[PDB]
Design an enzyme around this catalytic site. Structure first.
Site, mmCIF file in Angstrom:
data_model
loop_
_atom_site.group_PDB
_atom_site.id
_atom_site.type_symbol
_atom_site.label_atom_id
_atom_site.label_comp_id
_atom_site.label_asym_id
_atom_site.label_seq_id
_atom_site.Cartn_x
_atom_site.Cartn_y
_atom_site.Cartn_z
ATOM 1 N N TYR B 27 -5.415 6.231 -5.766
ATOM 2 C CA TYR B 27 -5.991 5.210 -4.898
ATOM 3 C C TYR B 27 -5.180 3.940 -4.619
ATOM 4 C CZ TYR B 27 -10.145 7.922 -4.596
ATOM 5 O OH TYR B 27 -10.982 8.965 -4.271
ATOM 6 N N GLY B 31 -4.743 3.851 1.086
ATOM 7 C CA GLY B 31 -5.268 5.202 1.077
ATOM 8 C C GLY B 31 -6.008 5.507 -0.205
ATOM 9 N N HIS B 47 -10.902 -1.732 -5.415
ATOM 10 C CA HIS B 47 -10.260 -2.633 -4.476
ATOM 11 C C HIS B 47 -10.367 -2.044 -3.068
ATOM 12 C CE1 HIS B 47 -6.807 -4.502 -2.337
ATOM 13 N NE2 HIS B 47 -7.154 -5.559 -3.044
ATOM 14 N N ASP B 89 -8.863 -9.050 -3.767
ATOM 15 C CA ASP B 89 -7.528 -9.125 -4.346
ATOM 16 C C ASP B 89 -7.540 -9.723 -5.743
ATOM 17 O OD1 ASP B 89 -5.591 -9.854 -1.297
ATOM 18 O OD2 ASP B 89 -6.914 -8.213 -1.857
#
Ligand SMILES: CCCCCCCCO[C@@H]1O[C@H](CO)[C@@H](O)[C@H](O)[C@H]1O
EC number: 3.1.1.4
Lengths: 122, 122
Positions: B27, B31, B47, B89
């Site tokens: 991951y 993608g 995320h 983030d």
């Protein structure tokens, strides 16, 4: 199995799948991310949604049985799960064939970071 | 922006993100397919699910504002969409830091064909 999918594509399309399709757009190969790049990238998007439905077996590494009876792929076998994945592969190869005219060489080897952050829904 | 995410990771983790995280597991990076490889691959999975919620802006290429106030990332600004992606983030970098102990070098540069055919649900 993916090696069978590869033969279905080479036959219907005439192109070497590992080169022309394994890395095309945003959904061909790997998994997928963002919005399908073009008509051909959408074929991959669908093929992906298809493999998502297969529950009882491994659409990637499970060998299925099919036949090129009459210039057409004929999925067979007594296993419905495998027949299911075979129908996924069969539909994609057909899809690639029907959209061959809109195939852009700039999308093969397409960078994922360039793909949409908002993925489309199956 | 991904370049800001990159600094957050380098700071909290000590590792050069482009090398140690950009291609980790199934991951990490743009993608993701199958099931998260390990604890660190799951940080990326989350995320990714995070960026999926951001609607009004581009989590990938939109610059947000944050501050390293007190050894901790402090997301700011008047834009909630951007603040939203900043929180995504910030959470991942922290996640990478907390699981650094179970980071396996064999998963960086991990091949996607090897990832599960059945992706996990956000
Ligand atoms: C999860 C950690 C990501 C930190 C930012 C790294 C910036 C590089 O980004 C990487 O670029 C590659 C080539 O362009 C892509 O194939 C990767 O999917 C992408 O993550």
């Amino acid at each position: 199995h993916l090696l069978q999918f590869r033969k279905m594509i080479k036959k219907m399309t005439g192109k070497e799948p590992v080169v022309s399709y394994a890395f095309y757009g945003c959904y061909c190969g790997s998994g997928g991310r963002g919005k399908p790049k073009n008509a051909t990238d959408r074929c991959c998007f669908v093929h992906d949604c298809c493999y998502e439905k297969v529950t009882g077996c491994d659409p990637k590494w499970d060998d299925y049985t099919y036949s090129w009876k009459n210039g057409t792929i004929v999925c067979g076998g007594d296993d419905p799960c495998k027949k299911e994945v075979c129908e996924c592969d069969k539909a994609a190869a057909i899809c690639f064939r029907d959209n061959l005219k809109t195939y852009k060489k700039r999308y093969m080897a397409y960078p994922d970071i360039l793909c949409s952050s908002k993925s489309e829904k199956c």
